[PDB]
Symmetry: D2
Subunit: 505 residues, 4 copies
Amino acid sequence: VTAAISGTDEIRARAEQALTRCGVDLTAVKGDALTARTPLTGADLFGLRAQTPEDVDRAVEAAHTAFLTWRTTPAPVRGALVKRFGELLTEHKQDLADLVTIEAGKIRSEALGEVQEMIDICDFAVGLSRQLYGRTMPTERPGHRLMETWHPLGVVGVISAFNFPVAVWAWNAAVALVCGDTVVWKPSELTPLTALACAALLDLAIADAGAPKGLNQVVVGAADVGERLVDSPRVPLVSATGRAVGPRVAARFGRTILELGGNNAAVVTPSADLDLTVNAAVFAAAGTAGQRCTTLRRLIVHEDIADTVVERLTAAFERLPIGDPFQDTTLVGPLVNEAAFGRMREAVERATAEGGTLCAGGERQFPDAAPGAYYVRPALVRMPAQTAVVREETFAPILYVLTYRDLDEAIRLNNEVPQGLSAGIFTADQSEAERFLAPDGADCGIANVNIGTSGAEIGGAFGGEKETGGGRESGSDAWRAYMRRATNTVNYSGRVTLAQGVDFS
Amino acid sequence: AISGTDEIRARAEQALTRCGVDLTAVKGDALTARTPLTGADLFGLRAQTPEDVDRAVEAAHTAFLTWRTTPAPVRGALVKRFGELLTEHKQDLADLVTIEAGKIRSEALGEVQEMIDICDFAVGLSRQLYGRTMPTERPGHRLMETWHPLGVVGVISAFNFPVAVWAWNAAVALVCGDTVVWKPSELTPLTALACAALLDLAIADAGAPKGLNQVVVGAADVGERLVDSPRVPLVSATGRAVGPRVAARFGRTILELGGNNAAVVTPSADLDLTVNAAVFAAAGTAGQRCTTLRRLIVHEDIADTVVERLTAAFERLPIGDPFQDTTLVGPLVNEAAFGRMREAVERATAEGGTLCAGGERQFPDAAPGAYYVRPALVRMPAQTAVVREETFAPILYVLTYRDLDEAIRLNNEVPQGLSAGIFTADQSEAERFLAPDGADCGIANVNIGTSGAEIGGAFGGEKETGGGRESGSDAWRAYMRRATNTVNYSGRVTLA
Amino acid sequence: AISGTDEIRARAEQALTRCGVDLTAVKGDALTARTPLTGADLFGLRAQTPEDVDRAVEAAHTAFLTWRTTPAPVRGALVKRFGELLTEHKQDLADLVTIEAGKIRSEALGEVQEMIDICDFAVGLSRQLYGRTMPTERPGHRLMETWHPLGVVGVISAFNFPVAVWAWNAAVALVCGDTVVWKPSELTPLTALACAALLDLAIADAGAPKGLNQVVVGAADVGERLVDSPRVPLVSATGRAVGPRVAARFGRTILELGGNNAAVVTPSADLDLTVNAAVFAAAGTAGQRCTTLRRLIVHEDIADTVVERLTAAFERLPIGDPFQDTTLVGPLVNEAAFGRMREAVERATAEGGTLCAGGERQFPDAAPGAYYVRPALVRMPAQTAVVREETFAPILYVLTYRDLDEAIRLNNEVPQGLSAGIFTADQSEAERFLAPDGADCGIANVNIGTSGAEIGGAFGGEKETGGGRESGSDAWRAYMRRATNTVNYSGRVTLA
Amino acid sequence: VTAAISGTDEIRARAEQALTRCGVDLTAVKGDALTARTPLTGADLFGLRAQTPEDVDRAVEAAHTAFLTWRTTPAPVRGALVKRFGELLTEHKQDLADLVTIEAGKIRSEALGEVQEMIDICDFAVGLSRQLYGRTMPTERPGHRLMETWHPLGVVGVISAFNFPVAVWAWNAAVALVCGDTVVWKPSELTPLTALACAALLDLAIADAGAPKGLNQVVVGAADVGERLVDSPRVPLVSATGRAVGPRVAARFGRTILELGGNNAAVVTPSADLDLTVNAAVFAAAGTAGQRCTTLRRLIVHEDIADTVVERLTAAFERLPIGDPFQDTTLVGPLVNEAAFGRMREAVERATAEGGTLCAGGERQFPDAAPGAYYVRPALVRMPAQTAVVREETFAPILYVLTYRDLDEAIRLNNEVPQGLSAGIFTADQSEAERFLAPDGADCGIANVNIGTSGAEIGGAFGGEKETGGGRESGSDAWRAYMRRATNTVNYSGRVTLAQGVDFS
């Protein structure tokens, strides 16, 4: 139950080294308006310059200028830029992953994985640059041709959260760039440094490619900066990941991609492989300290095996190594800030008040080793019913355990929450697996068999349903949200249908 | 010679009866059916309350729970049967369309035929609704994307296409496993009652659930209750408040909100083709299509001759009773439509325009409650305010250009973005117009006008038109939910 | 109680007449129509010569020149009309199918319904036939892929599905803008004549070209002339020489050449489900489907109980007149089919097999010219020669396994590769069977037998089955030619 | 009319340098069975070891072993191999292009372009590795699911020609590898060295990736080696590019991709931009010394402009710089061998015998500067009709000029030849452009507007119709030919349709 944590100064030096290697000019970005910080110790690292709302508008207009050139640049040439950027990400993978650990608190292997996701979406987007497929199709009209074409849309506003500080932007920017769009990115106020590093690498790729300078810009600021971006008439698409954005953008006839959180469950049936299940559940519940939109928060377990599953998860949660995310031994790093810790404790108290039993975890670990940081053991809570606290997502590592008998009851328990991001079923039974994925099964955007709620990869469309917000990012044909469809009828016959047969001559 | 109100009423009652409507059950005192042919009220109807809308959604949701597990090809059999009944009653439904919308008989028949055609397309879709299978990075896993029924679809339609818009939505939604609650225009309730009765027959013939489709007749408050329902995940609206309201409750919308459609006429344009296409697209349906041609952007070297030829055509357009086959232009829907038209033309002349032809009310004494008008042709010195904001009336504004990029800019400058066309014999001009830096609309055509669209194409527009697509290509995806499914068959945990 | 030849002849003549066939015009002395129900000749028919095949191709090619520019949705209207006529005459056509193929009435009805269903699917396709638009690397250029009508399609069909295979080919080919020349099995000419007459009515109703479809009745030399025609770019053959011959003249083929289909029965299989599925897939159509279940690969722990249960089922199968609704198994097509069956069973017992049930000729005195047989169940010690080469007869070979990878290897070891199934309650076994290292067939199913297929799926197989696909998904692409089109609108030469 | 040509010795030294840089072991590949050669001088460079037919069978079996591992290696992992290979091609682009010039005689800029095509298809294939899309679709059966899946096929035999000695293999191998297939490549007997270099680079990528060793092998030999590859029962797909292969493979129920040549035309209408047209026609007719399958061989010109077009093409052909393909000034390098030159001269003689007029070119240039090499000026021949010599493709730079009046006549003249690879129309008229591309227009696999018969790129499917052979390679969904389709119905209902309602229990 004890851990050595890196000092703020050692963290700052590592951040500075990483930023400089990624080509950031520290003198130019430093200032006294905002502050970079680290959840590893809770402390401020150094001050940053901020953009004003007026600067956001200047950025959007510059991005629109760039768009006017980029939209007629051939998609395969646009893909060459993205290929160059992927090369630079590859070259600086370890440097960027350092920044991700520093700002989001993720363990090293997860930080590296997030940067690799960026590299993987660049590879995918380079492929898409020769596709972006529309259709050709028959027309009913003699001597006509009909097709559907896809065109670049305009400036895309990207609003990202602290928890995936680089991959969410990459999913959006790699795709948007190859689609002939330009990007203005408002990163989380908690994670500016990762964004600055990403932007500097992309600016080098842009300079190497001879591409337009305003293809991507980062706006560093607080909430008034984000609002100005959301409200811009020159931003036809806003992608927001990790609540008010949908209706405000719809009001000005813009488009949104929303992925707004998840309250994700897994069903454990009587035939589940318990070794597989426990391993999967622990990773999905405890990974990233319970701060993924896809984190496992509800486990719906058949009454015949619930006691044994709870025993095993209790033991696994008790053995989880919690500590500095730079240490190879660490599996759980810190929560992002005090507010997060407070919400976690409030939820666990309310759960025991609504009838629950705390089985494992929930306590702050080694508070005196880093007093400004909140390292916590993931909580396992057995619940007699799916009460309000279980239905209302807390962004923390709390796994509520519910029991069921009939699979249709498990499905109902999965579906009855307002969120609809991901779901999983652990079963050896062919029919149960298929029933879960059927139209009357789990209602979520992602529905998996024998893999947890974080089972997703670049090639799939990523997003959810219900209050998650309906958007899709990354794979399949999510790229269509970054373009506009045109239906084109071409007459080569020299004639038109004459109304009531009349020829006006 | 305008048909009499008594004759029209009798024709409406006979059509409704033949389509299976129970006149006693739908008659009442809350709302009135009317006709633009004379302006007269036909007879009174029962209305639904907001509470009835909630009951209808409940019924549709109950039906959905059964329908969503009914195999899609079986769902397609219902739509095939509906198409057969529409075919059987094409003339009766078309008479109701002419009576309530005022459109000429041939256009009314064409609208009912669109219904039949989308039924046939949806029967095809019922065996497709394609998702994907694709590789996964994880050993001993499989990955796919599936599409599932969404739920209850609310359909809000306008007076001008009182049956085809609902059919695009309902044929597709039903084969997608959804159910529908339809709020038709308060101007055109009878067409909806007839449609609903024919679909209820098909439902009976198929043994399908009774709540698959319901019509709610009423005013604003009925439509508002439908839009705000938490059990209506998709609202399809044709006719602006809807988008944000639905977004606020995390629902989905398909919005097609109007059009201010232009065509560009280049110096190599075939003028006989262009004049015919422009006249039909500007004057057709008395200028009351979402896809009506409202702006003609003509090259300065041919502008005088084009205006001369359109003036002559507009002066010759046959205006009259839409049940007479000689008629090209039927009446406007109501007095307010006429008022708005006149206000636009007055504004245009105050903004420097010249009225070249049309605009006058025709034979007011033949039917004082009806508004038959000659389409207006107005030459404008620039794209001023009145040109940029559409009026749902037959007014064609003529603008001039020299460089094609400026014609394109003029096309694109307005807030609407539904359809556009270019008339040209030049291969490169045609391609430029359709290019990524060309016309910005949802529909962009060469040598065919702004109503050049068909069932197999996705229909809808950009910008303030609202972004939705209906009908063809893969528009059906808006009626379903995508799932991404990873299946592990390895017995091991492999993380990405 | 077997229907008499005179009764059958009269029923055949009435069906043909009702379908629009002119009996005087088709009767003759060159070929004979026959029935497997009694083995009797029904009546004589005129035959085509090789020169008539060349005239038919010429006529089809002339029709093609018009049809290929007829808009696909208009082509789809013809197929929709055909589907309506098939629906009207479903019973009459089904009677001809039972008479000539010997299949039970319910299966004959199902085959005609497949025709109607592919017509409805093809009507959908008529608005799709999708190519692509995509980006080009070249500034000021556009790139697309389009699909165009191919030409005359030769269709060679077998006795066992005398109408549905031609319908899969003809509905799709016609909406794709192709024309068809059909050479039906010499065993089943009457069904083809009836089909052709109904389609000719639809053609007349639509005002379409008369040469869209033609039937050539004859022997080997007629089929050979069709295969070798330089004006037939696609040959679709169901029933081995065809592939190389057509390739030699740079034509295209779709080949579906037979099946030796297996199912794997795992220890967690639901035995009631499995026995029912196996009996129906092995015995259905007297074992004369391309998709008939011929090999059952059963886990050693349940093999004895499975064999016991199948023995009991096979002993209870009702064999008899296919016009009687009590019948499950009708007759084999002819004496040669019976001879081949007996030879296979004799070979299997010589290779170490045990005949567990069936194989005996039923009621030979009731109809001495007809071959009614009880399906045979043979337990085998290994997959020997007789197991690996299919016999078109109802024989089910039972093999045992222990490890699933060995069941998969046994499935895959044969030269045919049409369909396969796995019966299991185990999620991972189901997935393993369908995985890239699982069953190698064109169709691979879980908890449904080897005939588990439907209109919306691409149908066909791998290996010596021939590689072709018909019916659903994007099988239609084999009936068209792809073009890749780059359009320069820049006025400059930009090289790749 | 004069030129300095590199010496055989200088060429040999450059070839050796390139091979060594690409990681070929010269001692291991050298021998006395076969010979590497160069069309620049006509001479042999050095001897090579050859494979026997027995070695081909050994190679196929090793490739099948590799296939058994590769087919279950996840497609995105397979794409990582292809990405690494593209990196190595990038690093050795100039070295490989040297070999292409040496063996095929292509000018430097075309050789570099061919190697870049390899790099571009690797990028595309890396994208495809996350796609390979099948379908999910409704079933009519309650409580069932239906899908279509694509699986790796097996060993792919690649037979390539001298004229594109690296890109054709790359189109096949990049796609085949990501599709989970393995490859046995028989390069042209005229161009082994390019193949050896390609294979050595891919073997390094394989070693870096830890992939199976037998993923790709080159078999060096004469015709008996190719025949053994074509006839193998373990080779389910044979791709042959640049006549007997179709029927022989069909006989053993294999699949083929055939692209067997082209006799490609362009139509020049009265409204054609003549500067654009002449430039495009000269590149398309004279490029690669008329030795592309897509070379322009027939020009179908409207009678109103035919005289002026012929004048302009006459002047352009007379100004073409012919010489050593390593010199930046050179636009036309040599024909491949004496046999090619002999066929060219025979065709031009026969054309003048069938009524034609030689307008420009056709003569051997500077024979004494490289007596074993055949540098020729492209020939322009005006023909009064499309006679047998015009219909029968000669693999040499001969442009036959035909006149027309009605566009339907031009279309008929395009279509009446037995080949059907590519076609173009040069026109400013919107309706003519569309008529040419319509279903009753040009019948070829590739049909272009205002670009010549070599207007194709990676993203499009490449191939032709009629006696060209029907295959498609490279872009769109040509990848489907490298895989097998499965239709999968999955029952989760626990029941089956009972025949005649009978339950056997």
